[PDB]
Ligand binder design. Structure first.
Ligand SMILES: O=P([O-])(O)O[C@H]1O[C@H](COP(=O)(O)O)[C@@H](O)[C@H](O)[C@H]1O
Lengths: 561, 561
């Protein structure tokens, strides 16, 4: 094929955040050279001499525009001298799988076509996320580099006639005009490399007995029409032995079936209705690219993501990987409940409180200091890859159920009776105007930082709350030395309870206030009650010191989790 | 997994024939330790110090018993010290694919569970074919050493508890007692490695234009329910774009649908009748393990296997592989017609007449002296692997058709006019009485050695046949040094015509007299007339000169090919 040089006109808004470049599908399709300029910038950060012996892993969640985005990446990678492209079959490749294949075949990096839980289709979103050699997402130093080139780009090289058949497995070789070495495209089976990794981390024999035996565990997995569908079928139904009716919605639809692939009780309300009937012992829901999960137990019993990282850490050695590799350390994001801390302190293992964002967990994994990590936003993982893994959290839960012979409910009741219950809730204030939310945060910060606020007592019913610590979260990363200031206002009470405020939506007229309430309760009689009824006294106090209603006009949150 | 040693009793009839151990399924499942002893004998030929770093490839055509036998190969190969086994998914792997994979991954050899053109099922045939490092079948020195061990084996080693699942792709590792290194079973896709090899041999673009473009060559490919099924759908249908309706009987059945998987005019009768409708331009059928093929043109136009090698050799440069590799030499088996010979002599390329049974061609291929070869038993191939390849011959005919743009009947009319027509037909005289057959052969042998025989003139209807050479065919292989004598009575005439006698019998049921007629014709008009009438003179002369019906009682040929 021939290598053509196209003279282009640069764009100012192609700034890749740590989730890559997420935009509307109509933007990439209408803006001439939009996807082509960004794809060319990604390969331009790769040294020209490093390209011929370099491999790029490409894959996506199967949403609308993904097939044409992969075909564009092939034409540009070839014309730029990239030696080999490992593409998943039909372009399908889950985010945890892209991280597994990059580390397995020593790839220089990978391009993941996905907007995560963000909707797909002609009127949905589309994103291009770049991962580097360690399998993790590209860091700021690299995303800034891609941004500088995407806005100064005068030209881009492309092979217009190069057309690869994405549905056929195997190697495809293309000869480029007058070029001595051939361009190679390797189409891999979407699930195989990822399933071989899990087969070593877990005990697929104890699990086969658990899922398909006579006295077996009856599960129900909702893949939400996203990229984790084929992975549930091939691993949980085919190899582990669970009946095909266990894996529900396991077929990737380009529009996710007009639904949002996000693991939460309202977006995954169908699973919640299937679990109330009492027919199944374990239920689980996933996201677009399969790197997050929602664990449900019998009769609808919701397992909070913060309590889930504490259950796996309390039963970590029932998983073969950890028994052989050892637990190098535990970690959680600052807003995540204190349930993990109880376990890490009793087990005498290192605990790390990091700011929101997977990169902080990656830095500690690459430095051999982090084994298990959790986020309150449905996220659990481990140093097996450099991204979050929804299906790994589910097989880790099924491993604990098989080792203990107990129900999801009895394992958590047992956990709260040993460490105590960290009642957790997150209040989301969605389309809030910037000036009222920013002023609210500055006032609360000036109030907290008063020389007498530490020691102050708040009371909203029976128990009283004494403030022992009050600060605006600041983290110094021990690996790259970075200093992440202004990460969240924390009111830490002497009984272990916390109230956290986070302004997520910052640089925009529509700001988003995230309010996290964490109430610790060692009282064995109070541990089995409704979290909103026990958290009411501490929520009322958060609303009073923040003057939230007064600064935002909000008498109620948009979403409660 | 445990390693136990089973004491056994040896068998006198476990003799590996030229194409492996072909035998009725009844002997394999009824006789205790039958398959176990032969599999252990094959693995015993592997020097102990070389077993850990040795890989064996395993796969079969999918017939009855193939799955239980593969589970026996895994346990015995693991307990014997073999470090790695590469098996096709579900155990399904065609003979040409097994040869491709062995040569590609540098395997020590491979064990193919297939009885080829023999039928399968509870009351059918079974067979364990052993191939060596070069990808081809095990030579006499190796098959005979396996026979010497099976004849005297006193015990075998086995891991009873080991049970791998052929359905799941990927790497599976198992730990054996007192073994520092783990056992590896690598399940590979049945078509991938094989499709990549054909993708570098033929131009898949021109072929996609031929089968899916405006003209659309309406083909019909019958897989006879054997192993080539998945290979036809994945390569000819999905990749090259041929409408699913073209792939008839492409699903591997353990009983082959209650029929012989043999591509000849008697067993592949359905496909011929469907071709005689006039709708399709090209038709083809394959056998059990997939190394054979039957070529049909519009209206049922049968392309004789001996002429088919000559066509591919006359237009051999239409295929990219031979353009870049060149032609080291042509070869055929002695019984096969002289059509290829007429083509070989029209060029500066060597020609080899070899004894029937593919193993002879391999020796010429390893010494880089053979590029294209074929046998009148519907077998065609090339140095690209060390086995025959029916799907290769089909894509080679589709390559010739895309270059020529003519119909299968016109390509052969042009061929028969340029080199003349070598009329060929196969008269198999089934089960005759031993004394009458040996005497007929001895009588005609002495008659062919009469001092006044060469130069004598035969005459029947229109052609006068003068004897130029008359001998009893014997072979000296240039690589192994062996001398195979009395292979067949060759009555040769100076015009280019020939008659062949191959008395293949047994000290059991009876003796078969294989009559091959090779009537060469060079007249522009007579060549387009029916083979049965045009061959008539040489057929009567063979009967009158050998006194056939006279010493055998056979007035009509039992088999006709
Ligand atoms: O045994 P014979 O003498 O009748 O030999 C016949 O069958 C053998 C097995 O065929 P395959 O390689 O397809 O399994 C062939 O190689 C040989 O060409 C043919 O003459």
């Amino acid at each position: 094929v021939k290598i053509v040089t196209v003279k282009t006109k640069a764009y100012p808004d192609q700034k890749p955040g740590t989730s890559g470049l997420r935009k509307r599908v109509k933007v990439f399709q209408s803006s001439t050279n939009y996807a082509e300029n960004f794809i060319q910038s990604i390969i331009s950060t790769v040294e020209p001499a490093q390209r011929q012996e370099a491999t790029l892993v490409v894959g996506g969640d199967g949403r609308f525009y993904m097939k044409e985005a992969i075909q564009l990446i092939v034409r540009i990678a070839a014309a730029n001298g990239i030696g080999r492209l490992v593409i998943g079959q039909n372009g399908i490749l889950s985010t945890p799988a892209v991280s597994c294949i990059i580390r397995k075949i020593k790839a220089i990096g990978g391009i993941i076509l996905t907007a995560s839980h963000n909707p797909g289709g002609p009127n949905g979103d589309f994103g291009i996320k770049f991962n580097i050699s360690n399998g993790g997402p590209a860091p700021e130093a690299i995303t800034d580099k891609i941004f500088q080139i995407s806005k100064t780009i005068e030209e881009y090289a492309i092979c217009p006639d190069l057309k690869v058949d994405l549905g056929v497995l195997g190697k495809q070789q293309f000869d480029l005009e007058n070029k001595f070495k051939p361009f190679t495209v390797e189409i891999v089976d979407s699930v195989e490399a990822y399933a071989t990794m899990l087969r070593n981390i877990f005990d697929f024999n104890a699990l086969k007995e658990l899922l398909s035996g006579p006295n077996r565990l009856k599960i129900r997995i909702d893949a939400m029409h996203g990229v984790v569908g084929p992975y549930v079928k091939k691993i949980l139904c085919e190899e582990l032995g669970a009946p095909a009716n266990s894996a529900v919605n396991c077929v990737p639809l380009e529009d996710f079936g007009g639904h949002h692939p996000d693991p939460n009780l309202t977006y995954a309300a169908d699973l919640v209705e299937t679990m109330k009937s009492g027919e199944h012992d374990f239920g689980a829901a996933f996201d677009g690219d399969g790197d997050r999960n929602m664990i449900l137990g019998k009769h609808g019993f919701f397992v909070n993501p913060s309590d889930s990282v504490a259950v796996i850490a309390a039963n970590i050695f029932s998983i073969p990987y950890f028994q052989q590799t050892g637990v190098r350390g535990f970690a959680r994001s600052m807003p995540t409940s204190g349930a993990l801390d109880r376990v890490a302190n009793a087990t005498k293992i290192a605990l790390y409180e990091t700011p929101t964002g997977w990169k902080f967990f990656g830095n500690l994994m690459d430095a051999s200091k982090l084994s298990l990590c959790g986020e309150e936003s449905f996220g659990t993982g481990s140093d097996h890859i450099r991204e979050k893994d929804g299906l790994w959290a589910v097989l880790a839960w099924l491993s604990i159920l098989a080792t203990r012979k107990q129900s999801v409910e009895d394992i958590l009741k047992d956990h709260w009776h040993k460490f105590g219950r960290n009642f957790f809730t997150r209040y989301d204030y969605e389309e809030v105007e910037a000036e009222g939310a920013t002023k609210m945060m500055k006032d609360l910060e000036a109030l907290m930082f008063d020389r007498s606020f530490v020691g102050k007592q708040f009371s909203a019913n029976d128990k009283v709350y004494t403030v022992e610590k009050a600060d605006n979260f600041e983290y110094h990363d021990p690996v790259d030395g970075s200093v992440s200031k202004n990460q969240g206002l924390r009111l830490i009470f002497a009984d272990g309870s916390r109230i956290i405020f986070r302004l997520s939506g910052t640089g925009s007229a529509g700001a988003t206030i995230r309010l996290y309430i964490d109430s610790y309760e060692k009282d064995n009689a109070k541990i089995n009650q409704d979290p909103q009824v026990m958290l009411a006294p501490l929520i009322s106090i958060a609303l009073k010191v923040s003057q939230l209603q007064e600064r935002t006009g909000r008498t109620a949150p948009t979403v409660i989790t």
